[PDB]
Design a protein around this ligand. Sequence first.
Ligand SMILES: *Cc1cc2c(cc1C)nc1c(=O)[nH]c(=O)nc-1n2C[C@H](O)[C@H](O)[C@H](O)COP(=O)(O)OP(=O)(O)OC[C@H]1O[C@@H](n2cnc3c(N)ncnc32)[C@H](O)[C@@H]1O
Ligand SMILES: O=C(Nc1cc(Cl)cc(OC(F)(F)F)c1)Nc1ccccc1CCO
Length: 499
Amino acid sequence: GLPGDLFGLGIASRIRTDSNSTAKAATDFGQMVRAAPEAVFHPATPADIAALVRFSATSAAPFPVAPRGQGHSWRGQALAPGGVVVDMGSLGRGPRINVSAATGAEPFVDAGGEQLWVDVLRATLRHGLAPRVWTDYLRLTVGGTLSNAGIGGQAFRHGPQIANVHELDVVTGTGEMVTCSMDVNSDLFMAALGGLGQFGVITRARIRLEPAPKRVRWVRLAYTDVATFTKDQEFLISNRTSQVGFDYVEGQVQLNRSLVEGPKSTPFFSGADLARLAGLASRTGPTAIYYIEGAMYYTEDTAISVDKKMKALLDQLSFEPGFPFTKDVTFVQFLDRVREEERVLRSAGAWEVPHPWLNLFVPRSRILDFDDGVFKALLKDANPAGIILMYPMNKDRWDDRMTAMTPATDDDDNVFYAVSFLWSALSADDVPQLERWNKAVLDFCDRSGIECKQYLPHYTSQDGWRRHFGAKWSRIAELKARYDPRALLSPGQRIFPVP
Ligand SMILES: *Cc1cc2c(cc1C)nc1c(=O)[nH]c(=O)nc-1n2C[C@H](O)[C@H](O)[C@H](O)COP(=O)(O)OP(=O)(O)OC[C@H]1O[C@@H](n2cnc3c(N)ncnc32)[C@H](O)[C@@H]1O
Ligand SMILES: O=C(Nc1cc(Cl)cc(OC(F)(F)F)c1)Nc1ccccc1CCO
C-alpha cells in the first residue's frame, strides 16, 4: 500500500508494520469501527512527525496520517486505513512536561501534545499549581482534548480547556512546524483549538495555571423536578463573583429503571443511599432523579470551617430535603474520580464494550422542551447501562473565533446546556437500540426546531458538517486548503474529501 521510498527514510526506523502493532491502532474506545492502518509510526521527536507528514505531502501517492492519543474517541476519528497512525505516546520518551513558576511572572506549564492530563496534574502539583479546567477523565491527551474543546465542571467559570491555552506548537499538513498564539500565527492558533486535528498535529501546548487546592468537599444533591434542578444549576453558574459557591458544577439524569434495577452500591453511594433514592424515585409513582454535582475546593481550611461554607451554600438551594450526599477527598482524588469507576467497570467486564455515545450542546430556552421529548417521552421506560450527564455552561467564557461550536440563539442567551448520553452496550447486541435512541434524540431536535451543536461531532456528509460549522464553515474550508491542502490529516473525522 504505502510508497516504497517511505522505507528508505531516516524515520523508517520508527515505522512498525507488523500485524500486532497495526492491530493496536485498528479500533477505538467506541469498539464499533475496525479499520487497520498500513503502519504505526512511533516518532521519537515532533520533527519526526514533520518528516512523515512532509514525505506524504510531497509524495506521488499521498497517504492519510492520523495522530492517536489514547484512542478515547468512538466514531473512528483516530483511524487511518490505507495510511499511517501516529502513536503520539512515543513522543513521551523523556521529559515532556516543564513547569515555569519563576517569582514575578505569570506561571504556566509546557506539555507535549501526547501528555496525559493526569501526568500534567502530577507535575504541576509539585509546584503547588494546577490547570484550571479539567475533563471528567484524566487519561486523555493534551492534543486530543484541545482538538475538541475539553469540557468539564469548571468550564462555567474559566471556559473550556481551549480557553486556557497561551500557545501551541503545530505540525501542519505540509510538514511545517509552527509556533502559534493570539499574537503570532493567530489564524492557525484559532483553527487548531477545537480544530479536530484538521489543520495540524498539536505537539506542544502552553497551559494556564492557578494555585492548586489541597482538598475538595464533594456533594450530590437530589431533585425530582427538572424545572427546580435547572433553575438551581443556572443559579450555581450565575453568581461567579460571590464567595459562597462551587468551583465545579455538573449534573446527572438517572432514569427510573436505572435506580430500581441498578447496582446495590457505587463508588459514591452506599447501599443505604441507593435504597433511600429508590424510595424517593417512586413516592408518587415512577420518576427520574436529577442530581446536581458540586465541588468546593479548599487549601488549609479546617473541617469545621468547610462544613460552615458548604452549609451556607446548600442553605440557598432547593434539592429534596434530607437528600444531600457528601464526600471529602484530596484534590487528586476528586480530579481522578473516574479512574475508580473504570477499575470497577473493568472488573465487571463492562469497560471494553461498545460506546455509541452522543454529546449535545442544547440552548437554555429549549432545555425543558428537550427534557420533555427525550427523558419524559423517548427514554421514560429505558434502562441503558452507563450514565447521562446534564449541566449548563457560560458562552462568555468560550472564544467563538476558535473552531469549537456552541449553540447560536436569536436573543444571544449566555447559557447553554451540555447533555451527554454516555450509554454503553454491555453486549454488542445492545448497540442497535442505543443507535436508534441517538437518532431519535437528533430527529426530535430537528422536528422541534431545537438547534443543537454536537460536541465531538460526527457526520458522513458535507451537509452535516456545513450545518455544524455554520457561519465558520467558509473560514474553516479556507484554513484547511492552506494548512492541509492534500487533506492528509485525521481523515477519520470525515469532514474533507481527498483532493
Ligand atoms: C473515552 C472518554 C472520552 C472522554 C471522556 C471520558 C472517556 C472515558 N470525558 C470527557 C470529558 O469529561 N470532557 C471532554 O471534553 N471530553 C471527554 N472525552 C472525550 C475526549 O476528550 C476526546 O474524545 C478527545 O479526542 C481526547 O481523546 P484522545 O487523546 O484519546 O485522542 P484520540 O481518541 O486518540 O483522537 C481523537 C481525534 O483527535 C485527533 N488527535 C489526537 N491527538 C492529536 C494531536 N496531538 N493533535 C491533533 N489532533 C490530534 C485524532 O487524530 C482524532 O481525530
Ligand atoms: O465521560 C464523561 N464523564 C464520566 C463521568 C463519570 Cl462519573 C463516569 C463516566 O463513565 C465511564 F464509563 F466511567 F467513563 C464518564 N464525560 C464526557 C464524555 C464525553 C464528552 C464530554 C464529557 C463531559 C460531560 O461532563
